[PDB]
């Protein structure tokens, strides 16, 4: 029992619980054929919760539905309780089927930056047929895409060959940041995560406020904490595969006007992103490790964590 405590940190939905699950895959318990069935209920609710949100936007932004009977279908969807869901109806399938292909709702999804929408929404809704199949088993890729918030703090222990890494899963909202206090004891590493996609979005806990300016200032304060100067800080610029989607239309120059680099480059933009985060360090003697990651990609995760496993073991041993 050689133990080292690690901390997974980041602003609301930078992809923390996704790592916890990824670690359970590569070096952990694994997700067998039976266990995948437990998720089913949520995957549904996620699509419901994914959809419900887009209906409120039709009220909010004032975008009109093209086919007027789609309003009655969305009205049926509005009144379905997200909690009590257990099996998937054909009508609710058709209700969801219909509205997704509605071009007004497709226009409502173009502007998902203007309100709250789980980014795994386009993942679930283009393969509805597979899901709405009564004998549907969720793949391993489907479980990663699930949108299940983490409230409070959690210890998920994993035993690697040479060492037992104790990871700390935590809640990434301002409301849950008061709790983080109870685990800062005995720390060897922080794994700070930042959603590369969330550069144009606004936070969940408030209005008219940019998420990366949240992630920047938050990151900044974690460093400054003096019980962490004898602990290795690792940055993780997550959701890089979404950044490639996002960068193509939304311009980073409309949000961080300093950027001298070129628009429409998934690389050139992210190489400036890491510079803003790594420009927030007071301590010159302390060094900042950084990896780019696609948290829902198990092969990309297995190379970053192996290179990081070697990074940490060389430090404290």
């Amino acid at each position: 029992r050689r133990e080292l405590k690690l901390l997974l940190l980041g602003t609301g939905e930078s992809g923390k619980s996704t790592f916890i699950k990824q670690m359970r895959i590569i070096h952990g318990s694994g997700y067998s054929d039976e266990d995948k069935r437990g998720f089913t209920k949520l995957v549904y609710q996620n699509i419901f919760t994914a959809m419900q949100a887009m209906i409120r936007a039709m009220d909010t932004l004032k975008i009109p539905y093209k086919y007027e009977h789609n309003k009655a279908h969305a009205q049926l969807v509005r009144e379905v309780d997200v909690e009590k869901v257990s099996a998937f109806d054909v009508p609710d399938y058709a209700a969801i089927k219909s509205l997704w292909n509605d071009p007004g709702i497709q226009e409502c999804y173009d502007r998902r930056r203007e309100y709250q929408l789980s980014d795994s929404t386009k993942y679930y809704l283009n393969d509805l047929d597979r899901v709405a199949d009564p004998s549907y088993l969720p793949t391993q890729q489907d479980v990663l895409r699930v949108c299940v918030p983490t409230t409070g703090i959690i210890e998920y222990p994993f035993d690697l060959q040479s060492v037992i890494f104790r990871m700390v899963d935590v809640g990434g909202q301002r409301s849950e940041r008061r709790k983080w206090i109870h685990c800062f004891e005995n720390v060897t590493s922080i794994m700070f995560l930042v959603a590369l996609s969330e550069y144009d979005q606004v936070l969940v806990e408030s209005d008219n406020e940019n998420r990366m300016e949240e992630s920047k200032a938050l990151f900044r304060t974690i460093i400054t904490y003096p019980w962490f100067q004898n602990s290795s800080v690792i940055l993780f610029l997550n959701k890089k595969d979404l950044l490639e989607e996002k960068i193509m239309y939304s311009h980073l120059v409309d949000y961080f006007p300093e950027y001298d680099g070129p628009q429409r480059d998934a690389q050139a933009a992210r190489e400036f992103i890491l510079k803003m985060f790594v420009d927030l360090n007071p301590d010159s003697d302390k060094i900042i490790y950084s990896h780019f990651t696609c948290a829902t990609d198990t092969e990309n995760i297995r190379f970053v964590f192996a290179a990081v496993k070697d990074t940490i073991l060389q430090l404290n041993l």
Binding site: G38, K41, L42, Q45, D81, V82, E83, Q116, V148, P149, T150, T151, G152, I153, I154, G171, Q173, S175, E176, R178, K179, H182, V204, E205, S206, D207
Partner: protein, 128 residues
């Protein structure tokens, strides 16, 4: 007994139904500092059955300041949209003001805390 307990695995309402178990799951939610959500629901379960307008406008200010208000002691984890919603109804409060987040918070436990409780060792050693 070890059967009353094994009955709770079935669904999340079976765990709420028993009295002993309601104190232990709290003792576990405490052990993951996410008890503010369980106490809130029972604040809503006692709120939903409240009758007189006097008790409806005063109890409504107890729970808000606790779980909702910005930098509230037991601030449950929820959005700004549901917090804006419940911020306009408290004046002339009614049984179905909070339910917006009550159901969110129940979902927050069924999909996160409760499953972990069934994998917990304190639960499983109770099941023999």
């Amino acid at each position: 007994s070890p059967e009353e307990a094994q009955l709770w695995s079935e669904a999340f309402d079976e765990l709420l139904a028993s009295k002993y178990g309601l104190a232990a799951f709290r003792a576990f939610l405490k052990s993951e500092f996410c008890e503010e959500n369980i106490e809130f629901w029972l604040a809503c379960e006692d709120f939903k059955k409240t009758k007189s307008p006097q008790k409806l406008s005063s109890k409504a200010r107890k729970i808000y300041t606790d779980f909702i208000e910005k930098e509230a002691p037991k601030e449950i984890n929820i959005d700004f949209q549901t917090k804006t919603l419940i911020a306009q109804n408290i004046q002339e409060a009614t049984s179905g003001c909070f339910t917006t987040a009550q159901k969110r918070v129940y979902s927050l436990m069924e999909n996160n805390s409760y499953p972990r409780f069934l994998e917990s060792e304190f639960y499983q050693d109770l099941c023999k």
